[PDB]
Structure formats: structure tokens, C-alpha cells
Amino acid sequence: KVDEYGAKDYRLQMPLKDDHTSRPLWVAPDGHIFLEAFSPVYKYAQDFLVAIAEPVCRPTHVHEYKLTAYSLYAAVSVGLQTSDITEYLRKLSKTGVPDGIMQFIKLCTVSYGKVKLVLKHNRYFVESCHPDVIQHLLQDPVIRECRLRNSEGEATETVSFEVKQEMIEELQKRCIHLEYPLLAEYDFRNDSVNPDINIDLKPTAVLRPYQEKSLRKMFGNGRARSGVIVLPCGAGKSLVGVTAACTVRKRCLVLGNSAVSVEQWKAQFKMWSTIDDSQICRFTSDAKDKPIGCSVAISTYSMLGHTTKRSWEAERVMEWLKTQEWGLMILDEVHTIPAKMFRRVLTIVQAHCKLGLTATLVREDDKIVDLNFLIGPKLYEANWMELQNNGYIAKVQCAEVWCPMSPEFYREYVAIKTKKRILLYTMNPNKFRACQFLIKFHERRNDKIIVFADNVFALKEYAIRLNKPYIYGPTSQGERMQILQNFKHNPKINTIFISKVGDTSFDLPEANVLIQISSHGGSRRQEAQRLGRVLRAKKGMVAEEYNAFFYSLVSQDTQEMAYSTKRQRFLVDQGYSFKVITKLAGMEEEDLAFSTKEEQQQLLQKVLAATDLD
């Protein structure tokens, strides 16, 4: 029922009980659950809701989580039944639990853990203790096409059956339509087909409490289970992956976006894992190692997804991989998987346990529901503000700096309606002066300055005018590494311009000042990921609540405002606040570029010279 004010009148279906202060939870029948962080029972309720509910908003006081069938299946995979969860909700719900919510839980829980998929001898078997449901599944024509049949066309016959590998993904979508999700249970200790690997954990490795908690959530009943884990950048995600690989100790495959990530993973395994270097191989197009004896492999999506003809050695590597049975596979930046080519890689590789690690999951193409069956439910996602309080991560100080557009630029901004309009507001002379002032301020403050600019031309123009290193499309790898190492150590270099390549193509040296000038157009996940990757915990400023500094230069009254607001949606959902600043104190005293009008007019000439073709 809907009130005239737009609020849904839930008073009738939520009978309140007098245990107000003791019970901290509100259970709306829409599926949303509200928790008060100031309650003395916050920690227990937080831990309980993490397993059972998907977080939505985590601000300072009132947190909102959501209930999904995927969340319920994940909780079941943890090992929690319906009765205990319902009792705990009742002991914490301020009002009566709606029956429809209760009915929804009843419907989901019963159907969980019914259908199991097992990979043995390069054959996928669907089994269940209830052949009635199994026989029912035989009715589906899509299942009939997916179910492996004889070479004569005849379908094959605790009863199970082999399934076509190339038809697995379409079957997975059908399981949701059949309301019988697959059970990704792995014989963590009962495996005998795949021999172990002499890889252990070096004593220098330390698992933070949230890291160990997430690992224990993943390893239900001591058995590895495929899933998705969300860790903020700089929280030792690579350490967590190495730890999980050492724990499973079976055949381990890792996938990264670029060869730089591959090298980072190899260094991490050398830093923490006890596996011999000879058993570590990278399937890279430049550094090639034989797949033989490669206990743990690190590769990239493009190498495996190279649909065009590859090198003959690559053919041998692919054949060895297909022959090899993978107990464990590791995927990074899971938000990239929903692409068709990278999705095909999952079909290509035969792996038992597939774990995905990433910092964000808000795909602007909303291709995440199907991702729940590509890998599994989201196992864990840490509270960023909580890690800020715990000191694990730097407490970011975020600002939105409004730079008014020059009227001549603004008149031309209105004049252009096409994609060329981007260059108009991305090249604001007032924005340039503000950036110059901020750079001077932070250099006098002796801070590492990272200037993010998606537009190549704008980035090069800014860097050349300010006489600073710039990173762009080609970015020859030797020069890139040279500039990075100069930035890390040379005190003369503390201002680096990085184009869109800085998101995932390479590791970003730790900095404290991150200035964003150019936007993708609303990539709320990409820019947030890049921000989290840029800024990490810094010693010395641990006590202060603002040890990391981020500033977004936004052109006022432009379409950049809407993009910035849409982009910061996720970060606000993460509890991060953005203060709006218009007037920058100290700019008038300092002398900056484009002080005279014709200088800005000359810049306008230069930008307009770059027409729509550029």
C-alpha cells in the first residue's frame, strides 16, 4: 500500500513489539533491512546481516542491506538454516516479520543445495539425491540440448549424467529459470585426481581479521566454494589470493588485466607463497614459459580470449590447459567478465573452484545478475569506513572543486551539441589555473600528485604547459617504468599525469594527492576503482582523520556536473562525503597561467583547432 506522500504504508504488516532499544533491526517487507550502528548490538547484527543480506548503503549511522535469493543461497552455503536465521531476525526485528518475507525465505531455502555439479575426468556431472527433480529437468528442451548425448544423437543415462562443456553457461541461466541453482562444492581435502603442490605460507604473511573472516566464509565446512569477494584496493587483495591458493594447494590459475598485474601477482607469490619459482609460469605474449611443470599459472584474458590465430606455442599451452584439470582458478576485476570474449574464457577453461576478487561491482551495463551464475554469489564485502577507523586504509579527504566556465568558452559550450563539447569543458582555463594553484600548494606541502585525465589531448596539453611527465595511449613500457621509478624515489618528480591507462593496466605507486580533471562520462565504478587504487594507507598521518587527499575539478553549469553526481553515487553509498568548494584562497596572491584574457583566448583557439575529428 502506498501513502499519498510516496511512502509505502507498512504499519499494517509490521506489528511492533515493545523491545525497541534491545532490537536494532527494521525489516521492511520490500526486502530492505535497516540497522542502527549506535546500537550496543551493532557488531552481532552486522555479522549476521553480512552473511544473509547484501549491503546497499553503509553511512555513519543507519545502514541499509538488501535480501536476495543469491544472498540466501550464499548464507546456506555458509551453513545457516532457515529456523536459526528467522529466530535471530525476530530477536532483532523491531516489528513483526512479514509473512511474505518469511514465505520468500521458505521458498528459496528449500530449493537450495539440491542440484550439484561435479567435474571429474574432464566431464561435468549433474547429480541430486532426488531423481524426481532430475527427471523433471530432463523435460526442458534447452536442458535436452545442453545435456551430453552420444555421437549417435542419443542422450546418455544417486544418478547423474555428463554435460556438454560448451553448453554450461546457457544451462546456468536455465537453472535460475528452473529455480534450482547449481551447488559449487569442491572436495578441498577429498581430491585425489589432482596432486598437491609444495606451496605454503611464509611466516611474513599476516591475515587481518576481516581477511581471515572472508576466507572462512569462503571455505564453508572446510571445503572451497566458488564465489565473489569484494576487497578495497590496497587491502592486500593479492595477499588474500595467494593465501587462498596456498590453502587449496591444488592447480592454481590466475587471470589479470595486463602483464603488469601478472608481474605483481608473481612477486606476491614470491613474497608470501613457498612454491618453487620453477613451478611458476606466466602465459604472456612477451615473457613465455613452458606450461609443463607450471604448478601455478598467471595469464591474461586477452591471451586466453585471443579468438584470432595465435602462436604455435600458444596452441600447445591452450591444449595443455584444456588437458589440465584446474581445482582452483582466480579471476581479478570481475566487473570486466560480463564481456562476451572474457565470458567465453570461462567455457574454455575447465576449472573446479573459481574465485573472483575485485574492488567494485557496479557495472553500468547492469550485467551482474547473470554474473551471479558465471561465478557465484558475492561472498564478502568489507566496510570501508570500518577499515578507515581500524587504520588499515588511509582516510580519504574528498573534495569537489567547482571551476566556473569562461563565458567565451561557455558560449561555445552552448554552441556545440555534439561529442566535441567534451573538449570545451575539459579545457577550462579557470580549471587550469585552479589545478596549477593546487599543484603548487601540494608541492610546497611535499605530496605526491597524480593527475587523472581521460582525454589524451587534454592530458598532454596540461602536462606540457606545466612541464610534467605525461602518460597516454602507447606509453612505451620502458619509459613508463622509468617515469614511475623516478616518481617513487626522485624528489624532483612528484607530479605525474596519467591517462585512462592508470586504472588497471599497471600498478599505481602510492600517492596522497589525486586530482581528477577528465571523466569517462559517468563511470561510477571505473573512477572509484582508480581512486581507491591510487590512495593507500600512509604512515605518519595515521592519527589524523585526513591522511589522503582527493580533489575533483568540475566545470560549473556543464554536463560535467551531472556526470560527477552520478559518479559519486557509489562513493556516497560507501559513506564517503564530498565537500563542494568554489573559492580557492591564495590563488589571487599567486601568479598562474592564463592570467591575461588573450592567453585564455589563445587556448580557446588551440582547442577549437582540435575539431570533432580529434
Binding site: 501513502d3 511512502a7 504504508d9 543507519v62 556516497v572 559513506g575
Partner: protein, 446 residues
């Protein structure tokens, strides 16, 4: 406007009549500055007018402004007056009636304001001070509910008419309830003491409308100001105009009364502080804050009354209506709509600060500064356009003529905007005719 603002503009006769009540003199004295109180205490027994220079020489030269402000307050309130002191001097002497009544009040003697209830004995149906406060809240809640227009509140017709004269609600369509004006919303966002104070100011400005004596109401209010909480008083001994005013107050809940035939009446804490206006009661223990503000522009209300729900909905979009809780979101659309309805951002910020939850009181700022700034920016965006109708003068052939006409316009004060470099200016349409006639006369003079 504070209490002295209404008092400071009154005619001499009204002030003289009011000074006839010793309680009025006590209230006026307590409303004086400390320096003024000291002056009055000095002039307590002075039967001779005091020379202006002699009085003025007592205070420091630096504190003369405070002295002069106190002097002007005393003169305008007619507490004292100047007398033609012999020899050309101008002595200063307090009002004999006012000073006599003040001495009667302080030293004693004279007739009491009203008899006690010992004549009628103890009240058979005496109530409790918390019950009185709750009832007073209920009555004000009823008034606000009726202003909202919900059918749960039914009031007397004149009470609605009283607000109509107050300008809060205008009867656009007869028979149907009047539509509340923007000023009505602004008052609705005001805090309860300010609400009562402004309502009573509007009542006073229209005291003659009901044929009710202006002097009696103010003196009765002053008497109620010093009343003892939890204590009733005799209704008897008051004029029929005062009886009707007291009936109005009982309808307001400022005073508790069992029946219209009851001869006892209990003033409430709200009525007690009414004389002080908006200031004075800095330590008001109001209801605990039930509103939680989060960085995601979301508000959570620990309330069930339709009053606060309506108040919040006036400027935010409701999302969920729990039995004991309300979830709403702060949106630019809702805030701008509220501003277009006439509500200012500062009123919204102040109101939120008033009802801030004690959990949010732990933070060094009462409210998140970013949210406050965003609210202010949204308010500013509404009135970005500066509309100013006027007449443009641009055909000045000579700079000297433009300067002379600018001087004439500034003499007239009808100038809107001017540009000497371009020799152009803008004037008000009403003053345009005057400036046009002057320009023609100057050409005629040429």
C-alpha cells in the same frame, strides 16, 4: 519582533494606562538593561528631576553608546520624561504613576492583583504539571494539525478566521478550508516559542478588531508571566473582554481550565515564557531529537504524529512509513519545491538543528556541513535570475548631461543601475516620469 518592539511604538496614553499595574512595572523593569536597572534603582526615591548632563556624566565615555541606548529605551518607553527644570535646565524625572506602582510592588502595600483559591478551597479535580504540559502540547498540535488541514483537527470558526486575519491562510474558495500562504509555512517551520510569540503579536496588532481593550490584555499577560507553575487562580474579577481572551487562551492550551464555568485556571510553562518573547528561555528542555541525518541526504524520524511527518514531507520525499519510524530522502526537487513555496534554507537548517537526534549531537557539528552547504546552494539556485523592471536611459549625447542627470536621480533615489563609462542608466518606472519631465525641463531650461 521582541516585546519592547511592540511596547516601544505605543502611544503615550497606552503606556500610561499600562504603568498603572505594578506587575507591568515589574516586567518592564526586568526587561531593562543592567545599566538601566541601576539607573532606575538610583531614581527610586528621587522626587526631583535630574539634569541631563548630571545623569550623562555618570557613565563612561566608551560605554556612552550603551548609556545612550538605555537612555533612548527609557525615553521611548516613557519610563522617565524631561521637565523644564528652573533656570533653563532640562531635568529628567521618572513617571510618578509608574514609579509609585513599582514602589508599591517592591516595598508592598496596595491591593493584590487577584484573590487566591483558598476561598474556593482545594481543587476537586486538580491535575498534574506534566499533564498540563502534555495538554498544552496537544492544543498546539491541534492548531498545527488544523493548519495542515487534516480532518483529525476541528477548531472554532473564529480561530481559523483569526489566522486568516493573521495572513497565514487565505480562503481562496468559500466553504472549503483556506489555503495556507507562504508566510504560514514559514511560521510552521518556526520553533514553538517563536510560533506563539508571532501569533500573539498578530493578535495584539488586531486587538481593537474584537473590541477588546489593548491595556487589559498586556497587563494580564504580564501577570501570567510571573504566575506559579502548577497553581490556579481566580477567574473572577476580570472584564468580559478578559473573559473572552482567556477563553481564547484556553482554546490555545496556554492555560488549562476544566470547564467554561470553572473559576480556576492553570497557566502553562508555554504561557509563562510568552512574555519573554523569543529570548530568555535559553534552557528549554524540549522533546529529544528524533531525526537522524545521513551523508546520503536521508532523514530518519522516530515519530508517529502526522505533524512531524507533514513537516518533513514539506521539503523531502518520503520513502518508508514504519509504525514508529519514517524514512525520507533529501532531494533537490523537493527542496526547490519547498523554497518555491516560500521556505528559506536557513529555516530548514535551523529546524533540523532543533530536532537533531542525540546520537548526532555527539558530532562536533550538529549537522553534516556538506549537506548544509548543498541546501544553501539549492536555495541560491532558485533565485539566480535578478528580475528588475525599469526604464533605460541611453541617449546621452554629452557626458556632463549624464552626470547631472545621475546626480538628479540619486537625489530622487529612483536610480536602479548606472554606467558612467557607457553613459547609460536605469531608473524606476515610477521615477522615470519625474526624471523624464526633469530632462525635458532641462532642455527647456537650455
Amino acid at each position: 519582533r521582541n516585546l519592547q518592539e511592540f511596547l516601544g511604538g505605543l502611544s503615550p496614553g497606552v503606556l500610561d494606562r499600562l504603568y498603572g499595574h505594578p506587575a507591568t512595572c515589574l516586567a518592564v523593569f526586568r526587561e531593562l538593561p543592567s545599566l538601566a536597572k541601576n539607573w532606575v534603582m538610583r531614581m527610586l526615591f528621587l522626587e526631583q528631576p535630574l539634569p541631563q548632563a548630571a545623569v550623562a556624566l555618570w557613565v563612561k565615555k566608551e560605554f556612552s553608546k550603551a548609556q545612550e541606548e538605555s537612555t533612548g529605551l527609557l525615553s521611548g518607553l516613557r519610563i522617565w520624561h524631561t521637565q523644564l527644570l528652573p533656570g533653563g535646565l532640562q531635568g529628567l524625572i521618572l513617571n510618578p504613576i509608574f514609579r509609585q506602582n513599582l514602589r508599591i510592588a517592591l516595598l508592598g502595600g496596595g491591593k493584590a492583583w487577584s484573590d487566591d483559591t483558598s476561598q474556593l478551597g482545594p481543587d476537586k479535580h486538580a491535575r498534574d504539571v506534566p499533564s498540563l504540559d502534555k495538554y498544552a502540547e496537544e492544543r498546539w498540535e491541534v492548531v498545527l494539525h488544523f493548519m495542515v488541514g487534516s480532518p483529525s483537527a476541528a477548531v472554532s470558526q473564529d480561530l481559523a478566521q483569526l489566522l486568516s486575519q493573521a495572513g497565514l491562510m487565505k480562503s481562496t474558495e468559500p466553504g472549503e478550508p483556506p489555503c495556507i500562504t507562504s508566510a504560514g509555512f514559514q511560521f510552521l517551520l518556526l520553533d514553538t516559542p517563536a510560533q506563539l510569540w508571532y501569533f500573539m503579536l498578530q493578535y495584539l496588532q488586531t486587538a481593537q478588531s474584537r473590541g477588546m481593550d489593548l491595556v487589559e490584555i498586556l497587563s494580564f499577560l504580564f501577570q501570567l508571566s510571573f504566575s506559579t507553575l502548577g497553581k490556579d487562580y481566580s477567574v473572577e474579577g476580570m472584564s468580559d473582554s478578559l473573559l473572552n481572551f482567556l477563553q481564547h487562551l484556553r482554546e490555545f492550551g496556554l492555560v488549562f481550565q476544566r470547564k467554561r464555568k470553572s473559576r480556576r485556571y492553570y497557566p502553562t510553562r508555554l504561557a509563562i515564557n510568552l512574555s519573554s518573547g523569543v529570548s530568555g528561555a535559553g534552557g528549554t528542555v524540549h522533546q529529544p531529537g528524533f531525526i537522524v541525518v545521513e551523508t546520503n541526504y536521508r532523514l530518519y524520524a522516530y515519530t508517529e504524529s502526522e505533524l512531524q511527518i507533514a513537516l518533513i514531507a514539506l521539503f523531502s520525499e518520503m520513502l518508508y512509513r514504519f509504525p514508529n519510524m519514517v524514512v525520507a530522502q533529501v532531494t533537490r526537487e523537493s527542496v526547490q519545491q519547498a523554497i518555491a513555496s516560500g521556505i528559506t534554507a536557513q529555516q530548514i537548517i535551523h529546524f533540523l538543528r532543533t530536532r537533531a537526534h542525540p546520537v548526532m549531537l555527539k558530532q562536533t557539528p550538529v549537522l553534516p556541513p556538506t549537506i548544509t552547504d548543498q541546501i544553501r546552494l539549492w536555495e541560491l539556485e532558485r533565485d539566480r535570475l535578478r528580475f528588475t523592471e525599469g526604464v533605460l536611459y541611453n541617449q546621452f549625447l554629452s557626458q556632463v548631461d549624464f552626470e547631472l542627470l545621475l546626480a538628479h536621480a540619486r537625489e530622487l533615489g529612483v536610480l536602479v543601475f548606472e554606467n558612467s563609462a557607457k553613459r547609460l542608466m536605469v531608473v524606476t518606472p515610477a521615477g522615470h516620469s519625474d526624471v523624464k519631465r526633469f530632462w525635458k525641463r532641462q532642455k527647456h531650461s537650455s
